[PDB]
Each structure stands twice: as structure tokens, then as C-alpha cells.
Design a protein around this motif. Sequence first.
Motif, short mmCIF file in Angstrom:
data_model
loop_
_atom_site.label_atom_id
_atom_site.label_comp_id
_atom_site.label_asym_id
_atom_site.label_seq_id
_atom_site.Cartn_x
_atom_site.Cartn_y
_atom_site.Cartn_z
N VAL A 1 -1.72 -0.17 8.19
CA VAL A 1 -1.82 -1.23 7.17
C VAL A 1 -1.32 -2.53 7.79
O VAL A 1 -0.40 -2.61 8.63
CB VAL A 1 -1.01 -0.95 5.91
CG1 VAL A 1 -1.15 -2.07 4.89
CG2 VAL A 1 -1.54 0.30 5.21
N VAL B 1 0.90 -1.17 0.00
CA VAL B 1 0.00 0.00 0.00
C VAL B 1 0.92 1.21 0.00
O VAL B 1 1.90 1.23 0.75
CB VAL B 1 -1.00 -0.07 1.15
CG1 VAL B 1 -1.77 1.23 1.34
CG2 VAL B 1 -1.99 -1.21 0.89
N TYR C 1 -0.39 4.71 -0.34
CA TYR C 1 -0.99 5.82 0.38
C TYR C 1 -2.49 5.58 0.48
O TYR C 1 -3.01 4.84 -0.33
CB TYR C 1 -0.80 7.20 -0.32
CG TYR C 1 -1.23 7.23 -1.77
CD1 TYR C 1 -2.56 7.36 -2.14
CD2 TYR C 1 -0.28 7.11 -2.79
CE1 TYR C 1 -2.94 7.37 -3.47
CE2 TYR C 1 -0.65 7.13 -4.12
CZ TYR C 1 -1.97 7.26 -4.46
OH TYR C 1 -2.36 7.28 -5.78
N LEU C 2 -3.07 6.25 1.44
CA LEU C 2 -4.50 6.22 1.60
C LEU C 2 -4.84 7.69 1.89
O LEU C 2 -4.81 8.12 3.03
CB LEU C 2 -5.12 5.20 2.54
CG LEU C 2 -6.58 5.05 2.00
CD1 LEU C 2 -6.97 3.61 1.87
CD2 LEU C 2 -7.51 5.89 2.85
#
Lengths: 6, 256
Positions: free
Chosen positions: B243, B222, B224-225
Motif C-alpha cells: 500500500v 487500508v 486489508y486486501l
Amino acid sequence: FYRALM
Amino acid sequence: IGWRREGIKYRRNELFLDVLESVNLLMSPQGQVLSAHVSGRVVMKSYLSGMPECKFGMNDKIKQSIAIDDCTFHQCVRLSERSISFIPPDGEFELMRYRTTKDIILPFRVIPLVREVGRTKLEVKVVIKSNFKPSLLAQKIEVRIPTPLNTSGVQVICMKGKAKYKASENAIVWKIKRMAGMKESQISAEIELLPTNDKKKWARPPISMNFEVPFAPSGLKVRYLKVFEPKLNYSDHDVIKWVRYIGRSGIYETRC
């Protein structure tokens, strides 16, 4: 385990 | 929006992402991958104020780069690098589902060695090796060695974990609580055999494993969110983000 997401 | 109401508020804006993957493998005695693939899913758990506009970014060009054969999304995903955009439900929801077949990281290599001894004994040595970062631990490892039907008893020696001969199941089950990356382990077993019809040889079933690793076997990462709420006064960086990767075995067989 959960890890920080920058 | 039919999956998210409008007055949601949290003083602690936080989200948790889960990358759950099942890694499947069929390996020959000669070390060739006859077949392999990963089935994964990304589960999001979010406690975000408002009606946030999020952006999910992973290593998808197709260093780190991974190819996705196919995939399906949750209705909240606005289809069109090119990344995923959504206004997520609150609580837990499956954000996406995908399959991978290329550049898959096989967390474990199983090297079996069988020797026949006349007609009374079978000598089996099974070595397992963890193919991953040494700082990461696999957990719940199980190696299962099938024994013929004419097994009168089994003697095993294993310096790591515990092993049990299970007559009902016709197999030796070796269990290991944890195992760090880049390591080796072996089990030795002497299978005592009974007399049997000579003509019908034994069709040796594959040695199989069970394990759980803390990374995604497909290589997914992952990146970025991104959270954006135009109305409310909390920005992306106010959100606490986590994460977690839980890659587990599916069918993970090695032909002996």
C-alpha cells in the motif's frame, strides 16, 4: 514509498 | 466478465494499492478553517493468478475512524460493516473515488505576519509547521507569497530551502525539498515598494502552498486486501501486498 500490507 | 479474461497466471502473485488524495483548504488570518475537503481515489495494480475474489477494507465505520461524504466505484465492485467486493481487472485500475470533509488532517499550518512601513516597505514573516508524524517526510513543498504590483524589489531570508522573487508572477516562491512531521520553518521577506495611487489599497491575496505527504489527509487507512481464488491453489497469504499513500495539495490557501 510502498509499504507491506499484512 | 467483460473486464478480465480467464487464463491469467503469475508465479509471483502480487498487488499494489495507491491511495491518492488531494487536500483542499481555505483558512482565515484568524486560524478558522473557512472551507476544507479531500478528494481521493484508490488505484489498484494487481498481478493475481486466476479470477480472484477480493475484499477491500478501510476504516469506514464513520483509534481510526473516518466519514466519507460520498463516493463512486468501478463496475467490478459488488455494491453491498459493509465493505467492497470485487474481481478486479489485471494491471492498473481505479477501484474507487471519494470525497471527505470531516476530521481532515491539514498537513500544514501557515502563519503569516505582514507589517507596513510608511509607504516604502512591506515586512513579511511566514511560518510553516508540519502537522504530522515525525517519522514521515513531506516533499516538494512550495510556499508562495504574493507581492503588490508596485514592488520595486524583494529581499528574503530563509534558513531552510531556497526562495526566489518572481516579478513576472508577482510573488515570492520558497521551495523546500523535504520536511519532517512536527517541525517549524520560516521565511522573512522585505518588499521594497514604488509610489502608487494612494486611494486604491492593496487587496492581499492568500499565501498558498504546494506539498506532497506520504499519508492520506482524510484519515483513510487500508486495513486489508483479501484475495480468494476458489479454483487455483494459492491462498490470500500467498499474495504479496503493498500500500502507498500520496496526499497532495489542491487549493491550500491562507488569508493574510
